[PDB]
CSV table of N, CA, C and O in Angstrom, one decimal:
chain,number,residue,atom,x,y,z
A,1,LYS,N,0.9,-1.2,0.0
A,1,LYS,CA,0.0,0.0,0.0
A,1,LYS,C,0.9,1.2,0.0
A,1,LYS,O,2.0,1.2,0.5
A,2,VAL,N,0.4,2.3,-0.7
A,2,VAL,CA,1.1,3.6,-0.7
A,2,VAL,C,0.2,4.5,0.1
A,2,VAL,O,-1.1,4.5,-0.1
A,3,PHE,N,0.7,5.1,1.2
A,3,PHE,CA,-0.1,6.0,2.0
A,3,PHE,C,0.1,7.4,1.4
A,3,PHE,O,1.1,7.7,0.7
A,4,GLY,N,-0.9,8.3,1.8
A,4,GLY,CA,-0.8,9.7,1.4
A,4,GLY,C,-0.2,10.3,2.7
A,4,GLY,O,-0.4,9.8,3.8
A,5,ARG,N,0.7,11.3,2.5
A,5,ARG,CA,1.3,12.0,3.7
A,5,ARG,C,0.3,12.1,4.9
A,5,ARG,O,0.7,11.7,6.0
A,6,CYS,N,-0.9,12.6,4.7
A,6,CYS,CA,-1.8,12.8,5.8
A,6,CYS,C,-2.4,11.5,6.4
A,6,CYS,O,-2.6,11.5,7.6
A,7,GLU,N,-2.7,10.6,5.5
A,7,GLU,CA,-3.2,9.3,5.9
A,7,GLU,C,-2.1,8.6,6.8
A,7,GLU,O,-2.5,8.0,7.9
A,8,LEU,N,-0.9,8.7,6.4
A,8,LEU,CA,0.2,8.1,7.2
A,8,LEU,C,0.4,8.9,8.6
A,8,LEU,O,0.8,8.3,9.6
A,9,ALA,N,0.4,10.2,8.6
A,9,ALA,CA,0.5,11.1,9.8
A,9,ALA,C,-0.5,10.7,10.8
A,9,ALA,O,-0.2,10.5,12.0
A,10,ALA,N,-1.8,10.5,10.4
A,10,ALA,CA,-2.8,10.0,11.4
A,10,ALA,C,-2.6,8.6,11.9
A,10,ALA,O,-2.8,8.4,13.1
A,11,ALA,N,-2.1,7.7,11.1
A,11,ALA,CA,-1.9,6.3,11.5
A,11,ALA,C,-0.8,6.2,12.6
A,11,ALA,O,-0.9,5.5,13.6
A,12,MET,N,0.2,7.0,12.4
A,12,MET,CA,1.4,7.0,13.3
A,12,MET,C,1.1,7.6,14.6
A,12,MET,O,1.6,7.2,15.6
A,13,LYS,N,0.2,8.6,14.6
A,13,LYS,CA,-0.2,9.3,15.8
A,13,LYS,C,-1.1,8.3,16.6
A,13,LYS,O,-0.9,8.3,17.8
A,14,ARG,N,-1.9,7.5,15.9
A,14,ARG,CA,-2.8,6.6,16.6
A,14,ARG,C,-1.9,5.5,17.3
A,14,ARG,O,-2.2,4.9,18.3
A,15,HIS,N,-0.7,5.3,16.7
A,15,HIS,CA,0.2,4.3,17.2
A,15,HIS,C,1.2,4.7,18.2
A,15,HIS,O,2.2,4.0,18.5
A,16,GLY,N,1.1,5.9,18.7
A,16,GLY,CA,1.9,6.5,19.7
A,16,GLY,C,3.3,7.0,19.3
A,16,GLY,O,4.2,7.0,20.1
A,17,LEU,N,3.4,7.5,18.1
A,17,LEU,CA,4.7,7.9,17.6
A,17,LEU,C,5.0,9.4,17.8
A,17,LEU,O,6.2,9.8,17.8
A,18,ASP,N,4.0,10.2,18.0
A,18,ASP,CA,4.2,11.6,18.3
A,18,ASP,C,5.0,11.8,19.6
A,18,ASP,O,4.6,11.4,20.7
A,19,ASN,N,6.2,12.4,19.4
A,19,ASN,CA,7.1,12.7,20.5
A,19,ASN,C,7.7,11.5,21.2
A,19,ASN,O,8.3,11.6,22.3
A,20,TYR,N,7.6,10.3,20.6
A,20,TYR,CA,8.1,9.1,21.1
A,20,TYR,C,9.6,9.2,21.2
A,20,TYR,O,10.3,9.3,20.1
A,21,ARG,N,10.2,9.2,22.4
A,21,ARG,CA,11.6,9.4,22.6
A,21,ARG,C,12.1,10.8,22.3
A,21,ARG,O,13.2,11.0,22.0
A,22,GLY,N,11.2,11.8,22.2
A,22,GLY,CA,11.6,13.1,21.8
A,22,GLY,C,11.4,13.6,20.4
A,22,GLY,O,11.8,14.7,20.0
A,23,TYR,N,11.0,12.7,19.5
A,23,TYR,CA,10.8,13.0,18.1
A,23,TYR,C,9.3,13.2,17.7
A,23,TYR,O,8.5,12.3,17.8
A,24,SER,N,9.0,14.5,17.4
A,24,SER,CA,7.6,14.8,17.1
A,24,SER,C,7.3,14.1,15.8
A,24,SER,O,8.1,13.8,15.0
A,25,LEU,N,6.0,13.8,15.6
A,25,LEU,CA,5.3,13.2,14.5
A,25,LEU,C,5.9,13.5,13.2
A,25,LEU,O,6.1,12.5,12.4
A,26,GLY,N,6.3,14.7,12.8
A,26,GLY,CA,6.8,15.1,11.5
A,26,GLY,C,8.1,14.3,11.1
A,26,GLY,O,8.3,14.1,9.9
A,27,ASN,N,8.9,14.1,12.1
A,27,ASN,CA,10.2,13.4,11.9
A,27,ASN,C,9.9,11.9,11.3
A,27,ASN,O,10.6,11.5,10.4
A,28,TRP,N,8.9,11.3,11.9
A,28,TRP,CA,8.5,10.0,11.5
A,28,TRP,C,7.9,10.0,10.1
A,28,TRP,O,8.3,9.1,9.3
A,29,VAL,N,7.0,11.0,9.8
A,29,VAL,CA,6.5,11.1,8.4
A,29,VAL,C,7.6,11.5,7.4
A,29,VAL,O,7.6,10.9,6.3
A,30,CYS,N,8.5,12.4,7.8
A,30,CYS,CA,9.6,12.8,6.9
A,30,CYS,C,10.5,11.6,6.7
A,30,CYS,O,11.1,11.4,5.6
A,31,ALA,N,10.8,10.7,7.7
A,31,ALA,CA,11.6,9.5,7.6
A,31,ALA,C,11.1,8.6,6.4
A,31,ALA,O,11.7,8.4,5.4
A,32,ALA,N,9.8,8.2,6.7
A,32,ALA,CA,9.0,7.4,5.8
A,32,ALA,C,8.9,7.9,4.3
A,32,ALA,O,8.9,7.1,3.4
A,33,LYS,N,8.9,9.2,4.1
A,33,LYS,CA,8.8,9.7,2.8
A,33,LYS,C,10.1,9.4,2.0
A,33,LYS,O,10.0,9.0,0.9
A,34,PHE,N,11.2,9.7,2.7
A,34,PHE,CA,12.5,9.5,2.0
A,34,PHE,C,13.1,8.1,2.0
A,34,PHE,O,14.0,7.8,1.3
A,35,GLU,N,12.6,7.3,3.0
A,35,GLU,CA,13.0,5.9,3.1
A,35,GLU,C,12.3,5.0,2.1
A,35,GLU,O,12.9,4.3,1.3
A,36,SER,N,11.0,5.1,2.1
A,36,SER,CA,10.2,4.2,1.2
A,36,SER,C,9.2,5.0,0.3
A,36,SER,O,8.5,4.3,-0.5
A,37,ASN,N,9.1,6.3,0.4
A,37,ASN,CA,8.2,7.1,-0.3
A,37,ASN,C,6.8,6.6,0.0
A,37,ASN,O,5.9,6.4,-0.9
A,38,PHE,N,6.6,6.3,1.3
A,38,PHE,CA,5.3,5.8,1.8
A,38,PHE,C,4.7,4.5,1.3
A,38,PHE,O,3.5,4.3,1.4
A,39,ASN,N,5.6,3.6,0.7
A,39,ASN,CA,5.1,2.3,0.2
A,39,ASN,C,5.5,1.2,1.2
A,39,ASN,O,6.7,1.1,1.6
A,40,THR,N,4.5,0.5,1.8
A,40,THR,CA,4.7,-0.6,2.7
A,40,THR,C,5.4,-1.7,2.1
A,40,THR,O,5.9,-2.6,2.8
A,41,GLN,N,5.4,-1.8,0.7
A,41,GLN,CA,6.0,-2.9,0.0
A,41,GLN,C,7.5,-2.7,-0.4
A,41,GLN,O,8.0,-3.6,-1.0
A,42,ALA,N,8.0,-1.6,-0.1
A,42,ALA,CA,9.4,-1.3,-0.5
A,42,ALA,C,10.5,-2.3,0.1
A,42,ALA,O,10.5,-2.5,1.3
A,43,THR,N,11.4,-2.8,-0.8
A,43,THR,CA,12.4,-3.7,-0.3
A,43,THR,C,13.7,-3.2,-1.0
A,43,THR,O,13.6,-2.9,-2.2
A,44,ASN,N,14.8,-3.2,-0.3
A,44,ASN,CA,16.1,-2.8,-0.8
A,44,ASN,C,17.2,-3.7,-0.4
A,44,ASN,O,17.5,-4.0,0.8
A,45,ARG,N,17.9,-4.3,-1.5
A,45,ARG,CA,19.1,-5.2,-1.3
A,45,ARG,C,20.4,-4.5,-1.1
A,45,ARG,O,20.7,-3.6,-1.8
A,46,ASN,N,21.1,-4.9,0.0
A,46,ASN,CA,22.4,-4.3,0.2
A,46,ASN,C,23.5,-5.2,-0.1
A,46,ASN,O,23.3,-6.4,-0.2
A,47,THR,N,24.8,-4.6,-0.2
A,47,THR,CA,26.0,-5.4,-0.5
A,47,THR,C,26.4,-6.5,0.4
A,47,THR,O,27.2,-7.4,0.0
A,48,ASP,N,25.9,-6.4,1.7
A,48,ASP,CA,26.3,-7.4,2.7
A,48,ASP,C,25.3,-8.5,2.9
A,48,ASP,O,25.3,-9.2,3.9
A,49,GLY,N,24.4,-8.6,1.9
A,49,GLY,CA,23.4,-9.7,1.9
A,49,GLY,C,22.0,-9.4,2.5
A,49,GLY,O,21.1,-10.0,2.0
A,50,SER,N,22.0,-8.4,3.4
A,50,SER,CA,20.7,-8.0,4.0
A,50,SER,C,19.8,-7.2,3.1
A,50,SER,O,20.2,-6.7,2.1
A,51,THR,N,18.6,-7.1,3.6
A,51,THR,CA,17.6,-6.3,2.8
A,51,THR,C,16.8,-5.4,3.8
A,51,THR,O,16.7,-5.7,5.0
A,52,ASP,N,16.4,-4.2,3.3
A,52,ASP,CA,15.5,-3.3,4.1
A,52,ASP,C,14.1,-3.5,3.6
A,52,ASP,O,13.8,-3.5,2.4
A,53,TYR,N,13.3,-3.7,4.6
A,53,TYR,CA,11.9,-3.9,4.3
A,53,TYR,C,10.9,-2.9,4.9
A,53,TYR,O,11.1,-2.4,6.0
A,54,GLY,N,9.8,-2.7,4.1
A,54,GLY,CA,8.7,-1.8,4.6
A,54,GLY,C,8.9,-0.3,4.5
A,54,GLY,O,9.9,0.3,4.1
A,55,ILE,N,7.8,0.4,5.1
A,55,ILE,CA,7.7,1.9,5.2
A,55,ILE,C,8.9,2.6,5.8
A,55,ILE,O,9.2,3.8,5.5
A,56,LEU,N,9.6,2.0,6.8
A,56,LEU,CA,10.7,2.6,7.5
A,56,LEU,C,12.0,1.8,7.1
A,56,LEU,O,13.0,1.9,7.9
A,57,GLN,N,12.1,1.0,6.0
A,57,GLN,CA,13.2,0.3,5.6
A,57,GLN,C,14.0,-0.3,6.7
A,57,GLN,O,15.2,0.0,6.9
A,58,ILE,N,13.4,-1.3,7.4
A,58,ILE,CA,14.1,-2.0,8.5
A,58,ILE,C,14.9,-3.1,8.0
A,58,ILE,O,14.5,-3.9,7.1
A,59,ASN,N,16.2,-3.2,8.5
A,59,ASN,CA,17.2,-4.2,8.1
A,59,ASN,C,17.1,-5.6,8.7
A,59,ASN,O,17.0,-5.7,9.9
A,60,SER,N,17.3,-6.6,7.8
A,60,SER,CA,17.3,-8.0,8.1
A,60,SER,C,18.6,-8.6,8.8
A,60,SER,O,18.6,-9.7,9.2
A,61,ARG,N,19.6,-7.8,8.8
A,61,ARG,CA,20.9,-8.2,9.4
A,61,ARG,C,20.8,-8.1,11.0
A,61,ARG,O,21.3,-8.9,11.7
A,62,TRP,N,20.0,-7.2,11.5
A,62,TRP,CA,19.8,-7.0,12.9
A,62,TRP,C,18.4,-7.2,13.5
A,62,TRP,O,18.2,-7.8,14.6
A,63,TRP,N,17.4,-6.7,12.7
A,63,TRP,CA,16.0,-6.7,13.3
A,63,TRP,C,14.9,-7.7,13.0
A,63,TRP,O,14.0,-7.9,13.9
A,64,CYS,N,14.9,-8.3,11.8
A,64,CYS,CA,13.9,-9.3,11.5
A,64,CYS,C,14.6,-10.4,10.7
A,64,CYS,O,15.8,-10.2,10.3
A,65,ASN,N,14.0,-11.5,10.6
A,65,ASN,CA,14.6,-12.6,9.9
A,65,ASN,C,13.9,-12.9,8.5
A,65,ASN,O,12.7,-13.1,8.5
A,66,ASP,N,14.7,-12.9,7.5
A,66,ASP,CA,14.2,-13.1,6.1
A,66,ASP,C,14.7,-14.5,5.6
A,66,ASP,O,14.6,-14.7,4.3
A,67,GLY,N,15.3,-15.2,6.4
A,67,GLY,CA,15.8,-16.5,6.1
A,67,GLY,C,16.9,-16.6,5.1
A,67,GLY,O,17.3,-17.7,4.7
A,68,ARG,N,17.4,-15.4,4.7
A,68,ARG,CA,18.5,-15.4,3.7
A,68,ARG,C,19.6,-14.3,4.0
A,68,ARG,O,20.4,-14.0,3.1
A,69,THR,N,19.7,-13.9,5.2
A,69,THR,CA,20.8,-13.0,5.6
A,69,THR,C,21.8,-13.6,6.7
A,69,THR,O,21.3,-14.1,7.7
A,70,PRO,N,23.1,-13.7,6.3
A,70,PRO,CA,24.1,-14.3,7.1
A,70,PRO,C,24.4,-13.6,8.4
A,70,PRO,O,24.7,-12.4,8.5
A,71,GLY,N,24.3,-14.3,9.6
A,71,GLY,CA,24.5,-13.7,10.9
A,71,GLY,C,23.3,-12.8,11.4
A,71,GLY,O,23.5,-12.0,12.3
A,72,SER,N,22.1,-13.0,10.9
A,72,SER,CA,20.9,-12.3,11.3
A,72,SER,C,20.8,-12.4,12.8
A,72,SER,O,21.1,-13.4,13.4
A,73,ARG,N,20.3,-11.3,13.4
A,73,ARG,CA,20.2,-11.3,14.8
A,73,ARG,C,18.7,-11.3,15.3
A,73,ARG,O,18.5,-11.6,16.4
A,74,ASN,N,17.8,-10.9,14.3
A,74,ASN,CA,16.4,-10.9,14.6
A,74,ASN,C,15.9,-10.3,16.0
A,74,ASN,O,15.2,-11.0,16.7
A,75,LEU,N,16.4,-9.1,16.3
A,75,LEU,CA,16.1,-8.4,17.5
A,75,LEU,C,14.6,-8.0,17.7
A,75,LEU,O,14.1,-7.8,18.9
A,76,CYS,N,13.8,-7.8,16.6
A,76,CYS,CA,12.4,-7.5,16.8
A,76,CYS,C,11.6,-8.8,16.9
A,76,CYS,O,10.3,-8.7,17.0
A,77,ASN,N,12.2,-9.9,16.7
A,77,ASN,CA,11.6,-11.3,16.9
A,77,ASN,C,10.5,-11.3,15.9
A,77,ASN,O,9.3,-11.8,16.2
A,78,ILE,N,10.8,-11.0,14.6
A,78,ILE,CA,9.7,-10.9,13.6
A,78,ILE,C,10.2,-11.3,12.2
A,78,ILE,O,11.3,-11.0,11.8
A,79,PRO,N,9.3,-12.1,11.4
A,79,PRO,CA,9.8,-12.4,10.0
A,79,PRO,C,9.7,-11.1,9.2
A,79,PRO,O,8.7,-10.4,9.3
A,80,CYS,N,10.7,-10.8,8.5
A,80,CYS,CA,10.7,-9.6,7.7
A,80,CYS,C,9.5,-9.3,6.9
A,80,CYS,O,9.1,-8.2,6.6
A,81,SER,N,8.8,-10.4,6.5
A,81,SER,CA,7.6,-10.3,5.7
A,81,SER,C,6.4,-9.6,6.5
A,81,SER,O,5.5,-9.1,5.8
A,82,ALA,N,6.4,-9.6,7.8
A,82,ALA,CA,5.4,-9.0,8.5
A,82,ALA,C,5.5,-7.4,8.4
A,82,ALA,O,4.5,-6.7,8.7
A,83,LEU,N,6.7,-6.9,8.0
A,83,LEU,CA,6.9,-5.5,7.8
A,83,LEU,C,6.5,-5.0,6.4
A,83,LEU,O,6.5,-3.8,6.1
A,84,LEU,N,6.0,-5.9,5.5
A,84,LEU,CA,5.6,-5.6,4.2
A,84,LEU,C,4.1,-5.5,4.1
A,84,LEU,O,3.5,-5.3,3.0
A,85,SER,N,3.4,-5.7,5.2
A,85,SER,CA,2.0,-5.6,5.4
A,85,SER,C,1.4,-4.2,5.3
A,85,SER,O,2.1,-3.2,5.4
A,86,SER,N,0.1,-4.1,5.0
A,86,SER,CA,-0.6,-2.9,4.8
A,86,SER,C,-0.8,-2.3,6.2
A,86,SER,O,-0.9,-1.1,6.3
A,87,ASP,N,-0.9,-3.1,7.2
A,87,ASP,CA,-1.0,-2.8,8.6
A,87,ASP,C,0.4,-2.4,9.0
A,87,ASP,O,1.4,-3.2,8.9
A,88,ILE,N,0.6,-1.2,9.5
A,88,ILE,CA,1.9,-0.7,9.9
A,88,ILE,C,2.2,-1.0,11.4
A,88,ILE,O,3.3,-0.6,11.8
A,89,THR,N,1.4,-1.7,12.0
A,89,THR,CA,1.6,-2.0,13.4
A,89,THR,C,3.0,-2.7,13.7
A,89,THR,O,3.8,-2.2,14.5
A,90,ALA,N,3.3,-3.7,12.9
A,90,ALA,CA,4.6,-4.4,13.1
A,90,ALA,C,5.8,-3.5,12.7
A,90,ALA,O,6.8,-3.6,13.4
A,91,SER,N,5.7,-2.6,11.7
A,91,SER,CA,6.8,-1.8,11.4
A,91,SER,C,7.1,-0.8,12.5
A,91,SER,O,8.2,-0.4,12.7
A,92,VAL,N,6.0,-0.3,13.1
A,92,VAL,CA,6.0,0.7,14.1
A,92,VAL,C,6.6,0.2,15.4
A,92,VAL,O,7.5,0.8,16.0
A,93,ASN,N,6.2,-1.0,15.9
A,93,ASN,CA,6.6,-1.6,17.1
A,93,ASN,C,8.1,-1.9,17.1
A,93,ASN,O,8.8,-1.7,18.1
A,94,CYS,N,8.6,-2.3,15.9
A,94,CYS,CA,10.0,-2.6,15.8
A,94,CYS,C,10.8,-1.3,15.7
A,94,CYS,O,11.8,-1.1,16.3
A,95,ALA,N,10.2,-0.3,14.9
A,95,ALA,CA,10.9,1.1,14.8
A,95,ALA,C,11.1,1.7,16.2
A,95,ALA,O,12.0,2.5,16.5
A,96,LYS,N,10.1,1.5,17.1
A,96,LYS,CA,10.1,2.0,18.5
A,96,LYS,C,11.3,1.4,19.2
A,96,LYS,O,11.9,2.0,20.1
A,97,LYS,N,11.6,0.1,18.9
A,97,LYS,CA,12.6,-0.7,19.6
A,97,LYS,C,14.0,-0.3,19.0
A,97,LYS,O,15.0,-0.4,19.8
A,98,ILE,N,14.1,-0.1,17.7
A,98,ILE,CA,15.4,0.4,17.2
A,98,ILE,C,15.7,1.8,17.8
A,98,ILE,O,16.9,2.1,18.0
A,99,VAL,N,14.7,2.6,17.8
A,99,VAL,CA,14.9,4.0,18.3
A,99,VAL,C,15.1,4.1,19.9
A,99,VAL,O,15.7,5.1,20.3
A,100,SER,N,14.7,3.1,20.6
A,100,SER,CA,14.9,3.0,22.1
A,100,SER,C,16.3,2.5,22.4
A,100,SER,O,17.1,3.1,23.1
A,101,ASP,N,16.6,1.3,21.8
A,101,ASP,CA,17.9,0.6,22.0
A,101,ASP,C,19.2,1.2,21.4
A,101,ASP,O,20.2,0.6,21.5
A,102,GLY,N,19.1,2.4,20.9
A,102,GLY,CA,20.3,3.0,20.3
A,102,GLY,C,20.5,4.5,20.1
A,102,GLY,O,20.2,5.4,20.9
A,103,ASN,N,21.0,4.8,18.9
A,103,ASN,CA,21.4,6.2,18.4
A,103,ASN,C,20.1,7.1,18.0
A,103,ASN,O,20.3,8.0,17.2
A,104,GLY,N,19.0,6.8,18.6
A,104,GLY,CA,17.8,7.6,18.3
A,104,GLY,C,17.4,7.3,16.9
A,104,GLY,O,17.3,6.2,16.4
A,105,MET,N,17.1,8.4,16.1
A,105,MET,CA,16.6,8.2,14.7
A,105,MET,C,17.8,8.3,13.7
A,105,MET,O,17.6,8.3,12.5
A,106,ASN,N,19.1,8.1,14.2
A,106,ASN,CA,20.3,8.1,13.3
A,106,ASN,C,20.4,6.8,12.6
A,106,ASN,O,21.3,6.6,11.8
A,107,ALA,N,19.5,5.9,12.9
A,107,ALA,CA,19.5,4.6,12.3
A,107,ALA,C,19.1,4.8,10.8
A,107,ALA,O,19.3,3.9,9.9
A,108,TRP,N,18.5,5.9,10.5
A,108,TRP,CA,18.0,6.2,9.2
A,108,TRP,C,18.7,7.4,8.6
A,108,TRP,O,18.6,8.6,9.0
A,109,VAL,N,19.6,7.1,7.7
A,109,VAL,CA,20.4,8.1,7.1
A,109,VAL,C,19.6,9.2,6.3
A,109,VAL,O,19.9,10.3,6.5
A,110,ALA,N,18.5,8.8,5.7
A,110,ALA,CA,17.6,9.7,5.0
A,110,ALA,C,17.0,10.7,6.0
A,110,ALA,O,16.9,11.9,5.6
A,111,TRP,N,16.7,10.3,7.2
A,111,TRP,CA,16.2,11.2,8.2
A,111,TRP,C,17.3,12.2,8.6
A,111,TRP,O,17.1,13.4,8.7
A,112,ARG,N,18.5,11.7,8.8
A,112,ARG,CA,19.7,12.5,9.2
A,112,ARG,C,20.0,13.6,8.2
A,112,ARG,O,20.4,14.8,8.5
A,113,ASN,N,20.0,13.3,6.9
A,113,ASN,CA,20.3,14.2,5.8
A,113,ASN,C,19.1,15.1,5.3
A,113,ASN,O,19.3,16.3,4.9
A,114,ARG,N,17.9,14.6,5.4
A,114,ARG,CA,16.7,15.3,4.9
A,114,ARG,C,15.6,15.8,6.0
A,114,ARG,O,14.7,16.5,5.6
A,115,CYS,N,15.8,15.5,7.2
A,115,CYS,CA,14.7,15.9,8.2
A,115,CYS,C,15.2,16.5,9.4
A,115,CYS,O,14.6,17.5,9.9
A,116,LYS,N,16.4,16.0,9.9
A,116,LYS,CA,17.0,16.6,11.1
A,116,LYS,C,17.2,18.1,11.0
A,116,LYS,O,17.9,18.5,10.0
A,117,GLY,N,16.6,18.8,11.9
A,117,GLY,CA,16.8,20.2,12.0
A,117,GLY,C,16.1,21.0,10.9
A,117,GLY,O,16.5,22.2,10.6
A,118,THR,N,15.1,20.4,10.2
A,118,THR,CA,14.3,21.2,9.2
A,118,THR,C,13.0,21.4,9.9
A,118,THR,O,12.8,21.0,11.0
A,119,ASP,N,12.1,22.2,9.3
A,119,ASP,CA,10.8,22.4,9.8
A,119,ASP,C,10.0,21.2,9.5
A,119,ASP,O,9.4,21.1,8.4
A,120,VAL,N,10.0,20.2,10.4
A,120,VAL,CA,9.3,19.0,10.2
A,120,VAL,C,7.8,19.1,10.3
A,120,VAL,O,7.1,18.2,10.0
A,121,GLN,N,7.4,20.3,10.7
A,121,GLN,CA,5.9,20.6,10.8
A,121,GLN,C,5.2,20.6,9.5
A,121,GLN,O,4.0,20.5,9.4
A,122,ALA,N,6.0,20.9,8.4
A,122,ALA,CA,5.5,20.9,7.1
A,122,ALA,C,4.9,19.5,6.7
A,122,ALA,O,3.9,19.4,5.9
A,123,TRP,N,5.4,18.4,7.3
A,123,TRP,CA,4.9,17.1,7.0
A,123,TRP,C,3.6,16.7,7.6
A,123,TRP,O,2.9,15.8,7.0
A,124,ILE,N,3.1,17.4,8.6
A,124,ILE,CA,1.8,17.2,9.2
A,124,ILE,C,0.8,18.3,8.9
A,124,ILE,O,-0.3,18.3,9.5
A,125,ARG,N,1.2,19.4,8.2
A,125,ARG,CA,0.4,20.5,8.0
A,125,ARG,C,-0.6,20.2,6.9
A,125,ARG,O,-0.3,19.7,5.8
A,126,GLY,N,-1.9,20.6,7.1
A,126,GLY,CA,-2.9,20.4,6.1
A,126,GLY,C,-3.6,19.1,6.4
A,126,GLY,O,-4.7,18.8,5.8
A,127,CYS,N,-3.1,18.4,7.4
A,127,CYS,CA,-3.7,17.1,7.8
A,127,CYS,C,-4.7,17.3,8.9
A,127,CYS,O,-4.5,18.1,9.8
A,128,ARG,N,-5.8,16.5,8.9
A,128,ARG,CA,-6.7,16.6,10.0
A,128,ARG,C,-6.4,15.6,11.1
A,128,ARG,O,-6.5,14.4,10.9
A,129,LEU,N,-5.9,16.1,12.2
A,129,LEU,CA,-5.4,15.3,13.3
A,129,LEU,C,-6.1,15.9,14.6
A,129,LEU,O,-6.1,15.1,15.6
């Protein structure tokens, strides 16, 4: 599924992402835009064997198990395929764990280069929340 900026902003808010660990809603919407362009089906192959799955491009080397990544750690205890679902519940719960257990939202280079320190309010403006 491809979400519209506002449709996604509302879903994430219902899932407790607004100001989760200090990151206002816009950061999460802005991340998703540049990571997957709001497509829950996005998959990206990397040089080390792993793949990024879903709306927040979560990696198979550390977070989920796709049965084809060497040294997989599966820290979210989830088959990577659950992250390709239309229901963003699984991608969110794992994203909350990656953001808790580490470097904040630095796990996402697109967020670091395109969202950090910008007016992230632009991502939720015009939306009915």
